[PDB]
Design a protein around this nucleic acid. Structure first.
Ligand SMILES: Cc1cn([C@H]2C[C@H](O)[C@@H](COP(=O)(O)OP(=O)(O)CP(=O)(O)O)O2)c(=O)[nH]c1=O
Ligand SMILES: [Cr+3]
Length: 325
DNA sequence: AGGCGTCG
DNA sequence: CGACGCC
């Protein structure tokens, strides 16, 4: 990295403006600038040089100026010392606990994991499971464990019904050496635009994975989406593998491509691509890609027979899953 | 960007 | 329903 310290600084300032202050704009800004700066070809030597960059104005230039001057930033240093801040920020690491919740738990004297482990009566189910697996939900999933996971999901999926098409998208499809959470797309001939929404098509799969005791817990659970916890079998006389996070989405059969596009790419990549959609008078959704009208309102979706087709609609160059970050 | 599912 | 927290 060339300006690592300034990007690192601005991002730390970003989390703080979200998790602690909940000033979305002051978080988006430190975010926008951090990227505009990671791109910048030369080493930044001053605040004004950097202010010429779009996405960085006077309050960010000032902090850059102080960071170059002194090898640090006071505001960052104080923030790191403030107990209520490091507390609030840390509770966010628990899945289920976001900005507001972390704040109340801190406001009420709950700050640590153990404190939380002594006050489960305040957490909801999701926050509780998160608290239950705070250490395991941290560890990254190697590329091989994801394969073994995919093996169990894929196998059992057909065992129930052969007409099921499962695709472990997310970071895995992109070719990552490790993964945060196993994202699996699912589709079936009974689910279509013309259908009337089948809640059993996903439930059937979950109960089957639960029966085999792969999916242990259940965070979210609905018709299309399922957020939960899964786990690989403990081969006799070996330490059981960590409990991972697993999302399962049920995309209509005739809208599959919108599904894999969305579920694969990248959060940021989707942000950029979907933004470019409106740029071309289109609206990319994970079910359909319908063009924005001659004034705003989007009409009927444009048929798609490949991710490729989607990239073509927005006059954009196709990005093979691996270059979506 | 854009949406699903939960809590009260 | 709106806010949340998440993907
Ligand atoms: C986090 C996030 C994700 N996605 C999309 C792109 C993601 O690949 C997919 C689900 O995200 P997730 O499985 O949490 O991340 P991953 O990209 O699969 C990276 P990791 O392996 O850390 O989960 O939906 C979004 O559209 N918006 C978001 O805010
Ligand atoms: Cr993932």
């Amino acid at each position: 990295t060339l300006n690592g310290g300034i990007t690192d600084m601005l991002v730390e300032l970003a989390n703080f403006e979200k998790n602690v202050s909940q000033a979305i704009h002051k978080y988006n800004a430190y975010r926008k600038a951090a990227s505009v700066i990671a791109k910048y070809p030369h080493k930044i030597k001053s605040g004004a040089e950097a202010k010429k960059l779009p996405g960085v104005g006077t309050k960010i230039a000032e902090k850059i100026d102080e960071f170059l001057a002194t090898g640090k930033l006071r505001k960052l240093e104080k923030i790191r010392q403030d107990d209520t801040s490091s507390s609030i920020n840390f509770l966010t690491r628990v899945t289920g606990i976001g900005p507001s919740a972390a704040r109340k738990l801190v406001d009420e004297g709950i700050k640590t994991l153990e404190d939380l482990r002594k006050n489960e009566d305040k957490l909801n189910h999701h926050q509780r499971i998160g608290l239950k697996y705070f250490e395991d939900f941290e560890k990254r999933i190697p590329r091989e464990e994801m394969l073994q996971m995919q093996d169990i999901v894929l196998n059992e999926v057909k065992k129930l019904d052969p007409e099921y098409i499962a695709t472990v998208c997310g970071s895995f499809r992109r070719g990552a050496e490790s993964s945060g959470d196993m994202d699996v797309l699912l589709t079936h001939p009974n689910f279509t635009s013309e259908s009337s929404k089948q809640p059993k098509l996903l439930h059937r799969v979950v109960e089957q994975l639960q029966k085999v005791r792969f999916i242990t817990d259940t965070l979210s659970k609905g018709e299309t989406k399922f957020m939960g916890v899964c786990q690989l079998p403990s081969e006799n006389d070996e330490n059981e593998y960590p409990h991972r996070r697993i999302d399962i989405r049920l995309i209509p059969k005739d809208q599959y491509y919108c599904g894999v596009l969305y579920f694969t790419g990248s959060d940021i990549f989707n942000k950029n691509m979907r933004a470019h959609a409106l740029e071309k008078g289109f609206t990319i959704n994970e079910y359909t890609i319908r063009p924005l009208g001659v004034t705003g309102v989007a009409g009927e979706p444009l048929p798609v027979d490949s991710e490729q087709d989607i990239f073509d609609y927005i006059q954009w160059r196709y990005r093979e899953p691996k270059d979506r970050s």
